[PDB]
Design a protein that fits this description.
The complex is a heterohexamer, with two copies of chain A and four copies of chain B (about 140 residues).
Chain A lengths: L3 H5 L2 H10 L4 E4 L4 E6 L8 E4 L3 E7 L3 E13 L15 H11 L4 H15 L2 E16 L7 E5 L9 H7 L7 E10 L6 H10 L3 E6 L1 E3 L11 E3 L8 E2 L9 E6 L11 E6 L7 E3 L25 E3 L4 E3 L1 E5 L7 E5 L12 E4 L13 E3 L4 E2 L5
Parallel strand pairs in A: 9-22
Antiparallel strand pairs in A: 1-2, 3-5, 4-5, 5-6, 6-7, 6-8, 9-13, 10-11, 12-13, 14-15, 14-16, 17-21, 18-19, 19-20
Helix pairs in contact in A: 3-4
Chain B lengths: L4 E8 L5 E4 L7 E4 L2 E6 L8 E2 L4 E7 L7 E9 L7 E10 L6 E5 L6 E5 L10 E7 L2
Parallel strand pairs in B: 1-11
Antiparallel strand pairs in B: 1-6, 2-5, 2-7, 3-4, 3-6, 7-8, 8-9, 10-11
Classes of the chains: A alpha+beta (about 375), B mainly beta (about 140).
Chain lengths: ~375, ~140, ~140, ~375, ~140, ~140
């Protein structure tokens, strides 16, 4: 009747548990996977709690489902921000890599080095993990499919649930069955290095520029404002807005390279019966419906860009206008971390034509833009 | 006769779906797009939801030589706000009246409903386009 | 008769102006909105400019009691390049035929035109919405 | 047959029972879970009583419930308030953390440090627990689902009830099957520190202010009072009241952080056919109906605030008025969990339609700190 | 006759005043509450204010023995901005027609109106409650 | 006939539920909202609790064509205290009487009931709103 307390007190068993579960390695994000590099130093002991409240559940709504869960406890790693005596120590190799990345001359080199480092070391680290064994079964039948998944316990007895349940008490087969706390790797660094790294990792540089009223459109209930003057070379704007004070220009921080999704996408004229832009990349989004005739070959449409889906979050509409033909939404951030700019993006409720793009409904995250960097 | 007819287009422009209910069609018949001989059942529309920017077309007409015209009613409801009524639509083109009647009744201030294209002076009821927006 | 009628809506979904010319009703008459008694002359529309995102309505019908129906034509001309013809629209809802006619003719590479709502199986031609764009 | 006496007399078995059941660690509140930090010093012995009254109960009301309970006894921990010779000693690390938190420069820093300390060490500690095993089964068919839960005994025999029952006398598998007494961790501290910690944990600072009678409303049976003058910057008020003497202003004590539910919430105007406020956050509540037109952009409506659900408890109505139109409720506390007697007002029939749910709550006294001097 | 009747309850559920004007019944007679024999001059309803959280009841009915039903109109206007029209009203409970009518017309963005209680199918129009809110 | 009708709106403004019991009508027929043709049985209404702030509607009308009018009763009971009767409501709009009657009986002091909108002089009984509260 051994528990996590029995394996944690034994150096051999504790190290076997640590190694077989990749507890010293970060997570790289086909899906999340552990990194081959060890991120933190091997601890002398682990903080753990015991939990043996096993469960067997089944359901036959033919979507039959089954779940045999057998927990053993929870293991918790302690982060620098907690301030406790025990703190996970970053591997000297990782710290040296960070310092080497930050030592390069230009910001582009510093960002590329950090990208390589975080690709080979992972983006996040699991600080709270639940240990044990879970056996799940699914059988959707109308044609017919069956799916058995085993995570922990003797996996060679997946076909025989009795023997798997019997084996669930062998400590050599305990695995991580759930993660309840994840901390960004950058958050494990000292404060100045943490700030520098988190600023460098931001995909976009930002800049405020005064605005000008779009000529015409007197029928609308609110004025339309666009960046005044010529856009600085290499910078891009995000769409029409109702803000009368400022507009946000953005610039990519990383050069385009094969295999990486650019932060911004070019926009192309619509196929037929519509003057709105369409995103060149599949799942990218822009924030404002274009007012006027879009054209990707001449300004200001030549410098309008759409954002990567991870840069934006859904917003909320505030409606203006006494009728549908006059109605327009203004997009405001869903007031809540991960806050979004109050750009006040304008979105016409009913565009004159047919076959128009889907109505934009998003606002840009404030954490994706770097300001006043001198870049 | 087939001469008395109506085309009703539910054109959703809001951010939420709207559901059609109680499609009765007390007089005349429903028919497929551009073909009055291809009779269709009200079940093809009853309980269906119109998603944003989606067009739904309902075509009604009098029978070939029944001298009846075509009359019918339906309701727009909010699929999320407890199936509450949005508006009640009643269309009527009698054969002998020589004066049609299209009416939208009920009240739900949470929805903006506009309609255009109807003709009432004489003849067919014309093509009616209805724009619905949920605010 | 008034039972034969048409409503033509020219709706400029583009961002460029368009003009109307050569509007003549070979059969029937033009009239105001919602009133077939209020006859109006073609001069009320000839030379009018359909501002972008603006709807212009032309209503045609036959005499009160006649077997004439309605017929007519009009040309859409682009004012930006010397009133070059965009399309030639011909509509016809006769009293003496069981089917109606709606024909867009001509070709212009700089313009896109679509239409909907026309009824041809029987009765009045219906209400026609025409979206025009300069792409 | 071994009992809790045999395991408590053996240092190895006693320590195994203590460690496998997390008896030295507090509870953090998806649900209550034990903390990884040891809150109390490891005792040399445990107070225990023996209970071996087993039970097997099944009912098939299409629901079918089964419960095999095999107790072994109860273990008691002794708290400082008991005054007995033996008292659980707090870990020196926890006491040092508390002292460090209370030593910071400003009250906000002290509150943040205490929040971190109690999030790491847990909020409460189990002082009476029951040891043994329990195997339960629930089945519901109409379409069908089955749910087996085992807590104690050989969990690898959950599928075979006979063997699990046979395994209930093995001491290595005994687990905590019930908790019958829980003590707040703050209550385990010495009195001068306990008072400070408990005061600093109160979410809201309170202040009594004078009141003014709302103009108009002569048709109502009672006068409606609101805070007099402009409320101090950074403070908020809870709602209209019939109290002609004083009104309560409240102020949050903690800044905003990820995962921290604010104590108060802003209110927004209703969608349609109603002039009453609606809570921005889903579950929160407010005390009184707004008499008049609510506007969140200008005072006094801009600073009216709702409350987190844990701050309030259901109250009772006393009705004034001769008819539905004039009927109004004065809310009163229900006779440690006392609540403020603010005499909040709630109109019975609001003229409009689609009005917010009718307020029915009163504010706890244990959530407001007075005379902090802050 | 007294079989055709309408009672409209203007209920100001808002916090700002509203006024009633141009209240004219073409047929029938305005009468007291519950009593159709005691006719009341229209001036007793023309131009009065409905304070917030108050109800104003207007009762109209056809003349006994007579056979004309009762139809009429009145305007809700906002007294705070120069009696700008809030919503126009029209009611019709005729003697010799099946469908009754109750129509709100006109509009301004600063007012919301929700009405209920009317019956349009047969018999008297019914008691109508009209909640108005300046929002 | 359809000309005689009544709508009873139970509006629960209190904090406790009220249950409808004994709904059945000696004459006439219950029907759906706004559709006298859609007959509905009392079983659909029996046993339904009006939760606080909820609104329930009873629509009764005379049959298609007869000297029937309508007549019926129901009871409001407290779901607690052993379903004790709150009030007993009776309504009748006869054909030959030309005089409606709506009556409420009971002595339950634990509840307060108000009702308004009935017509008694002549014609249809009209729409009656019944506000129920629990003191």
């Amino acid at each position: 009747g051994d528990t996590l307390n029995d394996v944690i007190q034994d150096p051999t068993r504790r190290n076997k548990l640590i190694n077989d579960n990749n507890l010293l390695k970060g997570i790289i994000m086909d899906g999340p996977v552990p990194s081959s590099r060890e991120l933190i130093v091997r601890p002398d002991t682990l903080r753990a709690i015991i939990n043996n409240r096993a469960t067997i559940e089944t359901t036959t709504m033919m979507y039959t489902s089954s779940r045999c869960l057998f927990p053993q406890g929870r293991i918790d790693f302690t982060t620098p921000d907690s301030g406790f005596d025990d703190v996970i120590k970053l591997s000297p190799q990782f710290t040296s890599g960070v310092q080497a990345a930050l030592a390069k001359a230009t910001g582009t080199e510093k960002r590329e080095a950090l990208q390589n480092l975080f690709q080979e070391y992972g983006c996040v680290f699991r600080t709270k993990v639940h240990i044990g064994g879970v056996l799940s079964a699914h059988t959707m039948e109308t044609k017919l499919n069956v799916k058995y998944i085993v995570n922990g316990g003797d996996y060679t007895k997946i076909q025989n649930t009795e023997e798997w349940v019997a084996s669930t008490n062998q400590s050599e087969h305990w695995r991580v069955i759930e993660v309840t706390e994840v901390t960004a790797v950058a958050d494990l660094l000292p404060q100045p290095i943490r700030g520098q790294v988190k600023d460098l990792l931001k995909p976009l540089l930002g800049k405020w520029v005064d605005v000008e009223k779009v000529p015409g459109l007197e029928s609308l209930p609110v004025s339309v404002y666009r960046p005044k003057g010529a856009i600085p070379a290499g910078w891009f704007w995000l769409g029409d807005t109702a803000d009368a004070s400022k507009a946000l220009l953005v610039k990519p921080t990383l050069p385009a390279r094969s295999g990486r999704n650019p932060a911004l996408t070019s926009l192309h004229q619509g196929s037929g019966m519509t003057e709105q832009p369409f995103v060149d990349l599949p799942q990218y989004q822009y924030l404002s419906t274009y007012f006027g005739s879009f054209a990707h070959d001449t300004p200001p449409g030549s410098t309008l860009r759409g954002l990567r889906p991870d840069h934006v979050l859904p917003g909320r509409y505030e409606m203006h206008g006494d009728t549908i033909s006059t109605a327009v939404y203004v997009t405001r951030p869903v007031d809540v971390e991960d806050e979004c700019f109050d750009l006040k993006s304008l979105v016409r409720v009913k565009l004159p034509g047919s076959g128009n793009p889907p109505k934009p409904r998003s606002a840009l995250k404030k954490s994706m833009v770097l300001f006043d960097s001198g870049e | 006769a087939y001469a008395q007819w109506v085309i009703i287009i539910i054109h959703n422009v809001g951010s939420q779906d709207v559901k059609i209910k109680n499609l009765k069609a007390s007089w005349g018949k429903l028919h497929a797009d551009g073909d009055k001989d291809a009779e269709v059942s009200a079940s093809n529309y009853e309980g269906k939801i119109v998603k944003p920017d989606e067009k739904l077309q309902i075509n009604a007409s009098g029978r070939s030589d029944a001298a009846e015209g075509t009359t019918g009613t339906f309701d727009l409801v909010d699929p999320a706000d407890g199936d509450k009524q949005v508006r009640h639509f009643y269309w009527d083109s009698p054969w002998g009246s020589k004066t049609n009647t299209w009416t939208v009744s009920g009240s739900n201030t949470k929805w903006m409903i506009e309609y255009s294209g109807q003709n009432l002076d004489s003849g067919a009821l014309g093509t009616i386009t209805v724009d619905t927006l949920k605010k």
